[PDB]
Design a protein around this ligand. Structure first.
Ligand SMILES: CCCCCCCCCCCCCCCCCC(=O)OC[C@H](CO[C@@H]1O[C@H](CO[C@@H]2O[C@H](CO)[C@H](O)[C@H](O)[C@H]2O)[C@H](O)[C@H](O)[C@H]1O)OC(=O)CCCCCCCCCCCCCCCCC
Ligand SMILES: CCCCCCCCCCCCCCCCCC(=O)OC[C@H](CO[C@@H]1O[C@H](CO[C@H]2O[C@H](CO)[C@H](O)[C@H](O)[C@H]2O)[C@H](O)[C@H](O)[C@H]1O)OC(=O)CCCCCCCCCCCCCCCCC
Ligand code: CLA
Ligand SMILES: CC(C)=CCC/C(C)=C/CC/C(C)=C/CC/C(C)=C/CC/C(C)=C/CC/C(C)=C/CC/C(C)=C/CC/C(C)=C/CC/C(C)=C/CC1=CC(=O)C(C)=C(C)C1=O
Ligand SMILES: CCCCCCCCCCCCCCCCCC(=O)OC[C@H](CO[C@@H]1O[C@H](CO)[C@H](O)[C@H](O)[C@H]1O)OC(=O)CCCCCCCCCCCCCCCCC
Ligand SMILES: CCCCCCCCCCCCCCCCCC(=O)OC[C@H](CO[C@@H]1O[C@H](CO)[C@H](O)[C@H](O)[C@H]1O)OC(=O)CCCCCCCCCCCCCCCCC
Ligand SMILES: CCCCCCCCCCCCCCCCCC(=O)OC[C@H](CO[C@@H]1O[C@H](CO)[C@H](O)[C@H](O)[C@H]1O)OC(=O)CCCCCCCCCCCCCCCCC
Ligand SMILES: CCCCCCCCCCCCCCCCCC(=O)OC[C@H](CO[C@@H]1O[C@H](CO)[C@H](O)[C@H](O)[C@H]1O)OC(=O)CCCCCCCCCCCCCCCCC
Ligand SMILES: CCCCCCCCCCCCCCCC(=O)OC[C@H](COC1O[C@H](CS(=O)(=O)O)[C@@H](O)[C@H](O)[C@H]1O)OC(=O)CCCCCCCCCCCCCCC
Ligand SMILES: CC1=C(\C=C/C(C)=C/C=C/C(C)=C/C=C/C=C(C)/C=C/C=C(C)/C=C/C2=C(C)CCCC2(C)C)C(C)(C)CCC1
Ligand SMILES: CCCCCCCCCCCCO[C@@H]1O[C@H](CO)[C@@H](O[C@H]2O[C@H](CO)[C@@H](O)[C@H](O)[C@H]2O)[C@H](O)[C@H]1O
Ligand SMILES: CCNc1nc(NC(C)(C)C)nc(SC)n1
Ligand code: OEC
Ligand SMILES: [Ca+2]
Ligand SMILES: [Cl-]
Ligand SMILES: [Fe+2]
Lengths: 37, 34, 32, 153, 243, 97, 176, 32, 35, 137, 51, 335, 34
């Protein structure tokens, strides 16, 4: 097979990781109360 | 108390899954040569 | 009982650090 | 038990199936108990009790003959159960009756032989096919077949 | 006439004999000559299980069900005296025979409903004044329905009535009042109703044929749960002889 | 109240003597000359309202009646219990050596 | 005297139902497989280094070339099983791992049976079996086999306990 | 809830199987 | 139900024929050298 | 701990008189008992009818008494039901039926006495084991 | 008493000399020691059920 | 088209297929897909099965109260015995699931396919020019499934006595087997455990000896595995150093130096041992059981002096006396 | 049925956590230049 030429690499910088996690964790702090209801 | 049984797992996977996502990327980014 | 295995492992890895990674040459065996 | 005054035809066993007589999957009257699995057994001693629908409750009720009673007793106490050291009976039995049915000896000996021979078959057939085409002694270091085939990858 | 081999495996063995379309006669009763039934036989055709109307009592009906076991349903070899009565009626009184067969049928839900389809201790009767047995000469009576499983039967945990464990030995320090019902086995005994209505007579050989309908309760499982009401429809064949 | 009729029966005469209306046939093998012939008659001849009613089984030879009279002290009688009589359990209750 | 040790463990500890004993066997059983399977793969994937049929003599005690086609073996299994080795160094380390790990697990399970901290029952199962008399699994069945093993053995197997179990107390099915 | 958990893991092992057989690293000769 | 029997039977015949007519097709031939 | 002649002293007849077997008769009986009984009476039980055993007490309450050499011997010649009210020589091995149970043909009065002696001696050695079944194995 | 080894154990009652006097039977068919046949009774001293 | 069928046969037999669908495969692939697909559904949703023919259904599927460890596919009814019970033999599926129909559909297709799987392990070896016999190693584990799934049932008179398809269901097969045959006391089973124990043993021996005598070609902080390239000419370990060590552990002549003789032994041992274990189950399928030393050693008076053989009998009686609670109506267990 | 409440989450994290571990590595390996 021929190495498909439509692929690029993927990236996530450290700051994005942080901004990401901050969002996941707090949403979790916001919705857990309603999940346990 | 009288809470929901699935609440714990709903909260656990709600945090783990997407966090595990980001982390997989960040680490694979971080280790890209040059 | 699990730690025993660690001892046997790490100990060995200390007395055989040299031969770790593999061995090499000659063909001496029987004949002091 | 029939001699003790029990009505075999209507006796109900622990499970509610029929201590002495029950029905097979296609309707025929057979002996009850774990023996329901052997309802395909036919034999001189037992046939005269069979009717057009299987065991007949009337013959069983008054046509059982003594020679049959002792035949059933003989065969009951000579089932093909025994140990290697020839101790007739169930594995938990006691020593005394030194016996192992000829039918057990024959059957086992011949299953072993029959088996190993099937291995023998596979073995000698596998050798013959490699011998013919000619590689039953190794892959030609030079022309290694696999090496001329595309990578399945 | 078919020997055993001529029936084996055909399922034919679980079928009460039949009379031809001709045989629609009448058999005579001497009333001064004892008679007996040399062979009564009952073949089920349908098993209907009355459904529990849920809490909303709205009147419940019987529903068909699939026969999950196989062709092992028929009762055969029934026998007893067919005494003639003062008023000229006839009452059959069974003595012995393959008078019961454990049957199991499934339902809409998937629920298996086991019953001990039987006619033990039958006491069937007819109309008063019945000189000769004509087509449709109704027989009606009761019988006994003994517990499905007998005294010695042990549940999956070893508990039994005549034998077995005293309690839930798997839960050594659990409260017992709640488990009461399932540890203490009870042996149920009940009555049943059946009616054999003739359709084919044959005074010649004295062998009548017909169809029956009987009702009884199903297994209560050593009294662990309530029994279901069952109705059973099929056909029968009887051999009347002076004797 | 749910009770195990059998474990309860063991608190009565049954449980102390051969019950002519319930006890299984093999029980008669513990007394001289009762087993085969008589035990069958006793069991076969339905329930009894009183131990003596056994002496009344139709046909009993004069000698049998003699023997019966001798062993009456070992018999009793109680309400017929279905759990113990159903299934023909009195001719074979699933117990052997 | 060892077979009773086995029977005992079934009967009293219901050892066969233990996650660790299982791993144990998966390893010993699985280890006796690698053994057999690797051996045959080698003997029937050999190069010809002799003119005889008995290819045993055709072996170079003094290294040099691989004596069997590692490349052919790979393709064989890769087509019959779907998966196949391709790194003798790993294939051989794997062979050390499988049975040594298995026995280690079977040990832990026993270290727990010392305190009697066994894997005897499944509570959810027992609870349903109590309330409902028609629920039956191959598990409940087994537990009854254990009861019998314990009741009929305990007497002559633990003499110091001067056990006396009246015939009437001995658990037994019908007829047997 | 338990049934779902048992079937899920099973379904996951079969998925693994697939990928392992059909998406392994093609096994390359000599050069490496 | 009597149908399924028929179908199953057909289906098994197919494959069993495919099998016999297979090794029959000069199978010894198929292999690296001597054929 | 041995098979003394003290143990081999078993009741000969109903009137108390006894006989003393010898280690030869014993072994011999034991061999004969295996040759023509074990088949169904292994260990003192009765496979084709577990309700009647060879326990001495069981034989005591038999009818007539079969708990002595004389008794068992008669039995091996003309067998009866526990109440004696019926001869069963047709479905039970015995001398009067050796044509039907060949194993009983060789058997001579000397042999019958040994077999009988064995039955009274065994429970003396084994005890409860002899009568009961698997419970005692 | 129940030896630690046993998950489940039978109810057997003996006197001082260790003679089996009463028990809870499995197969009642021939029970000689059922609590019923023996008139077994129980009394308590000290505690909730005292007296 | 060089000729369709001519082509078909070239594909089937093609050695260029990712998975070698062979001639044997044409039978294998379908039978194995049926066995597998029916099993998975059964194990998950099948309803209770009257395994012992006494109308006492044993539910063994997940959705009906089982977990992975307890759950299983239950054997066909005993009412059925050895009779063939194809779906088209039942008034309905409801009837078929109750008498354990799925069991037969599974065992038959599996045993069928697992054989062809052997037939295939030959074929591919042929199309590739390699010596046969690998398939002969696989004859042992197969000969076992056969013994446990078919021989034993034929011998015992019913498929209901075949090993169940589940974890606990298997322990049941074992515990009961032991009680009725006293297998632990049978030569063939012992040879079986020697082969299995031995196998695992040797598997560890080889595995270690070799792995421990690998020629160094890797860094101190690099997987020692990389020191091997797929498609090497020379060996990756010093089989002379290996033998040098092992010969000194025990003693020289008690150690292998011929890799070919080593590997033959390595294969021969387990396969031969398991062959006997399979012949054990196939032999005790006709009631020729293990040694019965019950009450062998007796003292001077005649008293019975117990041996461990007796303590084993008690444990066996417990199993005998309790298995199949309600299935027996008579004294002797002849079935 | 009458199972353990934590069984679900115990099984979930028992599978997720280590799987997430391996995966983080494999992907960061896989994306290393050269
Ligand atoms: C990778 C390569 C692997 C290669 C593996 C090769 C394995 C080869 C196995 C080969 C052969 C197995 C042979 C079995 C022979 C059985 C002989 C036998 O049954 O003979 C039966 C006789 C009789 O036993 C006697 O049986 C007797 C009585 O029966 C009776 O006799 C009485 C009167 O005498 C009464 O009449 C009584 O009622 C009646 O039942 C008495 O009870 C005696 O007391 C009792 O001792 O046998 C005895 O005594 C026997 C004492 C036997 C010890 C047996 C060991 C057997 C197998 C061991 C395998 C070990 C493997 C180790 C491997 C290690 C590393 C690999
Ligand atoms: C699959 C399953 C297949 C099973 C096949 C089972 C048996 C095949 C048996 C052939 C036996 C020939 C036996 C014999 O002649 O048996 C003779 C005796 C028999 O003893 C007699 O046994 C007799 C009775 O049997 C019988 O007699 C009874 C009545 O007396 C009953 O009729 C009963 O049913 C019937 O079978 C009597 O009891 C006698 O008194 C008693 O003395 O036993 C013995 O011989 C025991 C001999 C043991 C030999 C052990 C060898 C062990 C290891 C060898 C390793 C070689 C390794 C090579 C390695 C190479 C490379 C690694
Ligand atoms: C690829 C091989 C294959 C094989 C070997 C089998 C084999 C079997 N299946 Mg199966 N099956 C398969 C694929 C296969 N199946 C597929 C793909 C499906 C999905 C549809 C099924 C679905 C299925 C079901 C649903 C059932 C089976 C069942 C069975 C068993 C049935 C027993 C029987 O009566 O039929 C055997 C029939 C014969 C032996 C007769 C064939 C005779 C042939 C050789 C010759 C006929 C002569 C011909 C007319 C002359 C030739 C002339 C020439 C000029 C061409 C059997 C072991 C049943 C079962 O498991 O019961 C327990 C069952 O219920 N199968
Ligand atoms: C809905 C439904 C159906 C649900 C569930 C169904 C169900 C019942 C599932 C059961 C599964 C289950 C839970 C089982 C429990 C047992 C289990 C998995 C325990 C795991 C934990 C465990 C044992 C830990 C430590 C012990 C240990 C290391 C075991 C290892 C086991 C193992 C994988 C062994 C390897 C076996 C094997 C086939 C190796 C093949 C190797 C290879 C392909 C050989 C071919 C080959 C040979 C050569 O010589 C050469 C040269 C080459 C080149 C080559 O290729
Ligand atoms: C849960 C979330 C899982 C998220 C995974 C995201 C993976 C991104 C991979 C990527 O970008 O790769 C990019 C890489 C290669 O990337 C290239 O690498 C080169 C050097 O070799 C250079 O660095 C190139 O610049 C770079 O682009 O390709 C892959 O990773 C294919 C990965 C397939 C991963 C499947 C994971 C499946 C997990 C299943 C269940 C998990 C629980
Ligand atoms: C295995 C099976 C798996 C099944 C999985 C099924 C579903 C999975 C779903 C996973 C989702 C993961 C989403 C991650 C998104 C992410 O990382 O984005 C990261 C992005 C990317 O941002 C971009 O990153 C790029 C490089 O990667 C470049 O830097 C771009 O320039 C930049 O814009 O983030 C945003 O856009 C963030 C907006 C964030 C706003 C955050 C507010 C946070 C507030 C936190 C706390 C507040 C408290 C208040 C208290 C009072
Ligand atoms: C010809 C007639 C054929 C008739 C077949 C009938 C099957 C009936 C099964 C039934 O009634 O089950 C009834 C059962 C049991 O349901 C359980 O019953 C238990 C008590 O027995 C408890 O009450 C449980 O809580 C309850 O869940 O089945 C189900 O719930 C089944 C869901 C089944 C989903 C099946 C999918 C099959 C998919 C096949 C291929 C997929 C791709
Ligand atoms: C027809 C096909 C029929 C069945 C197909 C079964 C396929 C299983 C695939 C397992 C893949 C393992 C893998 O890729 O390993 C990859 C690894 C390592 O693989 C090695 O890696 C080395 C580098 O580190 C080199 O690349 C070697 O060449 C390479 O072989 O595994 C093995 O070698 C495994 C041998 C495994 C034998 C497994 C039997 C497993 C049964 C598992 C689960 C059963 C669940 C049942 C549930 C119900
Ligand atoms: C009643 C039956 C009804 C059946 C209906 C189906 C008919 C047949 C096939 C098509 C259906 C899809 C099949 C998927 C194929 C595949 O993945 O392999 C694709 C590869 C690629 O090659 C290949 O693919 C080539 C083409 S290409 O890559 O598609 O371009 C093609 O030319 C070549 O011949 C081929 O080998 O094929 C093979 O190597 C042959 C595979 C055989 C199948 C295996 C079955 C094994 C069962 C095992 C049991 C366990 C598993 C249980 C799972 C539930
Ligand atoms: C509760 C619930 C749920 C859940 C579920 C889940 C979570 C699932 C998952 C799932 C998954 C995650 C799945 C997966 C799958 C996979 C598959 C299905 C695969 C396959 C494969 C194959 C098939 C391959 C191939 C092969 C092999 C391997 C071998 C050989 C042969 C062949 C070739 C065949 C839902 C949401 C629905 C809804 C309702 C509820
Ligand atoms: C007791 C009952 C006995 C019944 C016997 C029934 C026999 C029925 C058919 C016998 C058929 C022989 O059939 C003939 O075999 C040869 C191989 O030898 C096939 O030839 C085949 O093999 C070659 C390779 O050798 C392929 O390249 C070719 O495409 C293929 O067709 C013929 O195409 C086929 O027609
Ligand atoms: C090559 C190392 N020597 C060696 N020797 C032996 N000898 C026995 C007897 C254990 C097979 N085994 C091995 S490991 C299969 N290796
Ligand atoms: Mn499953 Ca062999 Mn214990 Mn009779 Mn049933
Ligand atoms: Ca309901
Ligand atoms: Cl059962
Ligand atoms: Fe190797």
């Amino acid at each position: 097979m021929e190495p498909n030429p439509n692929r690029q690499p993927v990236e996530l910088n450290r700051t994005s990781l942080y901004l990401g996690l901050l969002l996941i964790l707090v949403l979790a702090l916001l919705f857990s109360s309603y999940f346990f209801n | 108390m009288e809470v929901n049984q699935l609440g714990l797992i709903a909260t656990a996977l709600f945090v783990l899954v997407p966090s595990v996502f980001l982390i997989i990327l960040y680490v694979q980014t971080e280790s890209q040569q040059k | 009982l699990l730690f025993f295995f660690g001892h046997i492992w790490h100990g060995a890895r200390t007395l055989f650090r040299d031969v770790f990674s593999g061995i090499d040459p000659e063909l001496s065996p029987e004949q002091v | 038990d029939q001699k003790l005054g029990a009505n075999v035809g209507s006796a109900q066993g622990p499970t509610g199936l029929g201590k002495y007589l029950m029905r097979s999957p296609t309707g025929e009257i057979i002996f009850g108990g774990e023996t329901m699995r052997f309802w395909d057994f036919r034999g001189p001693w037992l046939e005269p009790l069979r009717g057009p629908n299987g065991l007949d409750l009337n013959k069983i009720k008054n046509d059982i003959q003594p020679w049959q009673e002792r035949r059933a007793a003989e065969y009951m106490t000579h089932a093909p159960l025994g140990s290697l050291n020839s101790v007739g009976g169930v594995a938990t039995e006691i020593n005394s009756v030194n016996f192992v049915s000829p039918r057990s000896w024959l059957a086992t000996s011949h299953f072993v032989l029959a088996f190993f021979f099937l291995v023998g078959h596979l073995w000698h057939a596998g050798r013959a096919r490699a011998a013919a085409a000619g590689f039953e002694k190794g892959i030609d270091r030079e022309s290694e077949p696999v090496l001329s085939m595309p990578s399945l990858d | 006439t078919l020997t055993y081999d001529d029936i084996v495996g055909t399922g034919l063995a679980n079928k009460c004999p039949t009379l031809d379309d001709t045989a629609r006669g009448a058999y005579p009763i001497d009333s001064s000559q004892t008679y007996r039934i040399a062979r009564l036989c009952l073949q089920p055709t349908t098993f209907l299980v009355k459904e529990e109307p849920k809490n909303k009592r709205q009147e419940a009906e019987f529903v068909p069900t699939k026969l999950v076991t196989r062709e092992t349903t028929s009762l055969d070899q029934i026998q007893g005296e067919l005494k003639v009565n003062s008023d000229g009626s006839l009452t059959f009184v069974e003595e012995d025979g393959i008078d019961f067969q454990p049957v199991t049928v499934q339902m809409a839900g998937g629920e298996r409903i086991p019953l001990l389809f039987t006619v033990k201790n039958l006491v069937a009767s007819t109309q008063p004044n019945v000189t000769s047995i004509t087509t449709s000469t109704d027989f009606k009576g009761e019988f006994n329905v003994p517990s499905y499983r007998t005294a010695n039967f042990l549940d999956p945990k070893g508990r039994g009535l005549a034998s077995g464990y005293d309690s839930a030995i798997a839960l050594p320090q659990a409260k017992e009042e709640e488990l009461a019902r399932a540890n203490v086995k009870r042996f149920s005994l009940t009555k049943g109703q059946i009616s054999l209505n003739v359709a084919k007579v044959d005074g010649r050989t004295g062998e009548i044929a017909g169809t029956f309908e009987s009702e009884q309760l199903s297994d209560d499982d050593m009294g662990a749960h309530e029994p279901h009401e069952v109705k059973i429809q099929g056909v029968f064949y009887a051999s009347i002889e002076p004797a | 109240e749910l009770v195990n009729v059998v474990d309860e029966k063991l608190g009565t005469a049954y449980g102390e003597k051969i019950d002519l209306n319930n006890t299984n046939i093999a029980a008669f093998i513990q007394y001289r000359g009762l087993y085969p012939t008589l035990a069958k008659l006793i069991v076969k001849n339905a329930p009894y309202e009183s131990v003596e009613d056994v002496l009344n089984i139709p046909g009993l030879t004069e000698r049998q009646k003699q023997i019966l009279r001798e062993n009456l002290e070992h018999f009793t009688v109680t309400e017929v219990e279905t759990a113990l009589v159903e299934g023909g359990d009195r001719y074979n209750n699933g117990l052997y050596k | 005297a060892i077979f009773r040790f086995l029977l005992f463990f079934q009967g009293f500890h219901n050892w066969t139902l233990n996650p660790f004993h299982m791993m144990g066997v998966a390893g010993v059983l699985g280890g006796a497989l690698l053994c057999a399977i690797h051996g045959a793969t080698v003997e029937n994937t050999l190069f010809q280094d002799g003119e005889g049929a008995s290819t045993f003599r055709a072996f170079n005690p003094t290294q040099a070339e691989e004596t069997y086609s590692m490349v052919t073996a790979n393709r064989f299994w890769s087509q019959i099983f779907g998966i196949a080795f391709s790194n003798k160094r790993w294939l051989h380390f794997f062979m050390l791992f499988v049975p040594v790990t298995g026995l280690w697990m079977s040990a832990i399970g026993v270290v727990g049976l010392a305190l009697n901290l066994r894997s005897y029952d499944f509570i959810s199962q027992e609870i349903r079996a109590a309330e409902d008399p028609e629920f039956e699994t191959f598990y409940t069945k087994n537990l009854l086999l254990n009861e019998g093993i314990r009741a009929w053995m305990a007497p002559q197997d633990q003499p110091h306990e001067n056990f006396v179990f009246p015939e009437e107390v001995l658990p037994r099915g019908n007829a047997l | 809830m338990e049934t779902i958990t048992y079937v899920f893991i099973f379904a996951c092992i079969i998925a693994l199987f697939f990928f392992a057989i059909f998406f392994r690293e093609p096994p390359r000769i000599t050069k490496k | 139900m009597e149908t399924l029997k028929i179908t199953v039977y057909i289906v098994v015949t197919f494959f069993v024929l495919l099998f016999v007519f297979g090794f029959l097709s000069g199978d010894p031939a198929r292999n690296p050298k001597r054929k | 701990a041995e098979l003394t002649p003290e143990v081999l002293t078993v009741p000969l007849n109903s009137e108390g008189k006894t006989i003393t077997l010898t280690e030869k008769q014993y072994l011999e009986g034991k061999r004969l008992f295996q040759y023509a009984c074990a088949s169904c009476h292994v260990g003192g039980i009765t496979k084709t009818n577990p309700s009647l055993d060879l326990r001495t007490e069981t034989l005591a309450l038999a009818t007539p008494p079969r708990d002595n050499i004389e008794g068992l011997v008669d039995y091996m010649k003309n067998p009866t039901t526990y109440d004696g009210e019926q001869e069963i020589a047709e479905v039970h091995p015995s001398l009067r039926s050796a044509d039907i149970f060949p194993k009983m043909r060789n058997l001579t009065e000397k042999d019958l006495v040994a077999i009988a002696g064995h039955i009274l001696v065994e429970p003396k050695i084994l005890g409860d084991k002899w009568g009961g079944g698997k419970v005692y194995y | 008493r129940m030896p630690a080894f046993f998950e489940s154990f039978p109810v057997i009652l003996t006197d001082k000399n260790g003679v089996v006097k009463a028990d809870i039977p499995f197969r009642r068919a021939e029970s000689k020691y059922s609590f019923e046949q023996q008139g077994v009774t129980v009394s308590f001293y000290g505690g909730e059920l005292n007296g | 088209s060089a000729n369709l069928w001519e082509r078909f046969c070239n594909w089937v037999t093609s050695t260029d297929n990712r998975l070698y669908v062979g001639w044997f495969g044409v039978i294998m692939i379908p039978t194995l897909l049926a066995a597998t697909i029916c099993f998975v559904i059964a194990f998950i949703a099948a309803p209770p099965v009257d395994i012992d023919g006494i109308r006492e259904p044993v539910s063994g599927s997940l959705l009906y109260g089982n977990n992975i460890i307890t759950g299983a596919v239950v054997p066909s009814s005993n009412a059925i015995g050895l009779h063939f019970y194809p779906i088209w033999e039942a008034a309905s599926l409801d009837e078929w699931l109750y008498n354990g129909g799925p069991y037969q559909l599974i065992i038959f297709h599996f045993l069928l396919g697992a054989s062809c799987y052997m037939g295939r392990q030959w074929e591919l070896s042929y199309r590739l020019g390699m010596r046969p016999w690998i398939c002969v190693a696989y004859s042992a584990p197969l000969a076992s499934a056969f013994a446990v799934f078919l021989i034993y049932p034929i011998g015992q008179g019913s498929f209901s006595d075949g090993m169940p398809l589940g974890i606990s269901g298997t322990f049941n097969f074992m515990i009961v087997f032991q009680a009725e045959h006293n297998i632990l006391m049978h030569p063939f089973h012992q040879l079986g455990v020697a082969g299995v124990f031995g196998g695992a043993l040797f598997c560890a021996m080889h595995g270690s000896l070799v792995t421990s005598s690998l020629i160094r070609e890797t860094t101190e902080t690099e997987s020692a595995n990389y020191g091997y390239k797929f498609g090497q000419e020379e060996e990756t370990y010093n089989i002379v150093a290996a033998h040098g060590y092992f010969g000194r552990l025990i003693f020289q002549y008690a150690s292998f130096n011929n890799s070919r003789s080593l590997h033959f032994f390595l294969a021969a041992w387990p396969v031969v041992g398991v062959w006997f274990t399979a012949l054990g189950i196939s032999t005790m399928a006709f009631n020729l059981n293990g040694f019965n030393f019950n009450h062998s050693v007796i003292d001077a008076k005649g008293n019975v002096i117990n041996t461990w053989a007796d303590i084993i009998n008690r444990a066996n009686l417990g199993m005998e006396v309790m298995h199949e609670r309600n299935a027996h109506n008579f004294p002797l267990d002849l079935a």
